[PDB]
Each structure stands twice: as C-alpha cells, then as structure tokens.
Amino acid sequence: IIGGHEVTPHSRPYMASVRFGGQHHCGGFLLRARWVVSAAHCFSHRDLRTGLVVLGAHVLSTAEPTQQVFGIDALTTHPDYHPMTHANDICLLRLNGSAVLGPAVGLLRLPGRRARPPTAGTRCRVAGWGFVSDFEELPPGLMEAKVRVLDPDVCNSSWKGHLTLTMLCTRSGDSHRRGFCSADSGGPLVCRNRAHGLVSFSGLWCGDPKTPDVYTQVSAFVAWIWDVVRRSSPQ
Numbered sequence: 001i002i003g004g005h006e007v008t009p010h011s012r013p014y015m016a017s018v019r020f021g022g023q024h025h026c027g028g029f030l031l032r033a034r035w036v037v038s039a040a041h042c043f044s045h046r047d048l049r050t051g052l053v054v055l056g057a058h059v060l061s062t063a064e065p066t067q068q069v070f071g072i073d074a075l076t077t078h079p080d081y082h083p084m085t086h087a088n089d090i091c092l093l094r095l096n097g098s099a100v101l102g103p104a105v106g107l108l109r110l111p112g113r114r115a116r117p118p119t120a121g122t123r124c125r126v127a128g129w130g131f132v133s134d135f136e137e138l139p140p141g142l143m144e145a146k147v148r149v150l151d152p153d154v155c156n157s158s159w160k161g162h163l164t165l166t167m168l169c170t171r172s173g174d175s176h177r178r179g180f181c182s183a184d185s186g187g188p189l190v191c192r193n194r195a196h197g198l199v200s201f202s203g204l205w206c207g208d209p210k211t212p213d214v215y216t217q218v219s220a221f222v223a224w225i226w227d228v229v230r231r232s233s234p235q
C-alpha cells in the first residue's frame, strides 16, 4: 500500500494473506468460513500445494495466536480470465477447513447481485501487505490507504483504451500518491462496507496518477461467485 497507514491490529478481520513458499504473494478476503476471494493473476503457473492462506494476521512474520492458516482444496479461476488484459481477474479459493470466526477473523460482504459500480468520487479504503514505496520496502503490518473512485472514461484514456466494462479505478483525494502496490493484488476495495473492487493492476510507479489504480468491478461477478460456492457446497 502506497500513501497509507498501518491499521489497528485485526481491525480489518476479513483480510487474507496468500502465501507461496512461505512468503506473502497476494491479498484476498474472507467471503465465508471456507471461501476466500482473490485475483486470478495471483495463481498463474503456481503449484497450489506451495500455497497457504493466512487469516487473523497483522504482522505476517509473527506466529500470532489469532492467525489461522489453511491449505487450498480448490482454485476456481474465472473461466473468461485474460492475463494480457486483466479481464475477469478474479478467483475463488476453497479452503481445506472452516475458519473459526471471532474478533480477528470475520467476513466481508459482496455488493448486490445486480448492483451498479460506485460512482466517481465515492470514498473507499484499500488494504494490504504489499510494497509501501517504489523501493521494494515491506510494511510493518497490515496497511490501508484512503482512495476515491475515478471516472472510468478518464481512467480508460490514461490506460490508452485498454480497460473493460467490468473494471473500476481510483485516485487520491489529495496531491499525495495513494493506492495499491505489488503484493496487494486480490485485496478488496471497500466502499461503504462492501467489496466493490479487487486489486488488479497499476503502472510502473505505485499510486502514480498518470497510470490510475485498476480494480476488477466485483458487482459483475457476484452471480458467478455464488454459483461456484453453491455448486461446491456438496463435496
């Protein structure tokens, strides 16, 4: 997270850390006890068995008593995911057990099945354990930046017309660079307590207004998410 601040430990109980080979790779969020939503691009060419999902975390390096670590039983990538464009950059992770909910582990609500994306100007918050600068510097713990939704057409112009309809963007409320960075991918964009966006991609410089922060527009995938969860209910 760029231009953010460290959160009060366990104040975002839905935050998930997706590890590969022991190291934190991407973010995600707890949807249900055995379901985590993350970004499709986080799992490309990766052996699922090398992956772990950490809930109830603050300081990733500490074996915190609130931490709940799980294995991935099944990765369901969006069938129409396009790595070249980041179209449909969403996936579901079925955990090898059910998270025990409490103060440090909770769920984040999805938008309405047919909800519109948030309008330009909507105040949102984005969290992660990704880089805090363009110098590959890791945060002390879970971090969060305050962002505002940016006009999708203005965003599309800055991205030289490569955005899809199911994408939304953000900007900082002020002159300071605020947004996500590498390893924040898959983490949610929370606007009025709903997961409206999911960290997808950005430019060479984190939070740079010339290459605005692009998110997967979550509301367009709610019907798909529930159909995956439901069809995997009997197992």
Ligand SMILES: *[C@@H]1O[C@H](CO[C@@H]2O[C@@H](C)[C@@H](O)[C@@H](O)[C@@H]2O)[C@@H](O)[C@H](O)[C@H]1NC(C)=O
Residues within 6 Å of the ligand: 153, 156, 157, 160, 161, 162, 163, 164, 165, 166
């Ligand atoms: C995004 O914008 C596209 C148009 O972009 C413009 O045309 C291309 C060929 C380049 O010249 C580019 O720099 C221009 O900005 C639209 O075709 C596309 O439908 C738009 N996408 C959405 C979701 O609105």
Ligand SMILES: *[C@@H]1O[C@H](CO)[C@@H](O)[C@H](O)[C@H]1NC(C)=O
Residues within 6 Å of the ligand: 049, 070, 071, 072, 096, 097
């Ligand atoms: C879940 O998977 C991880 C990694 O494969 C493993 O260490 C853990 O024991 C598994 N848990 C259960 C309940 O099978």
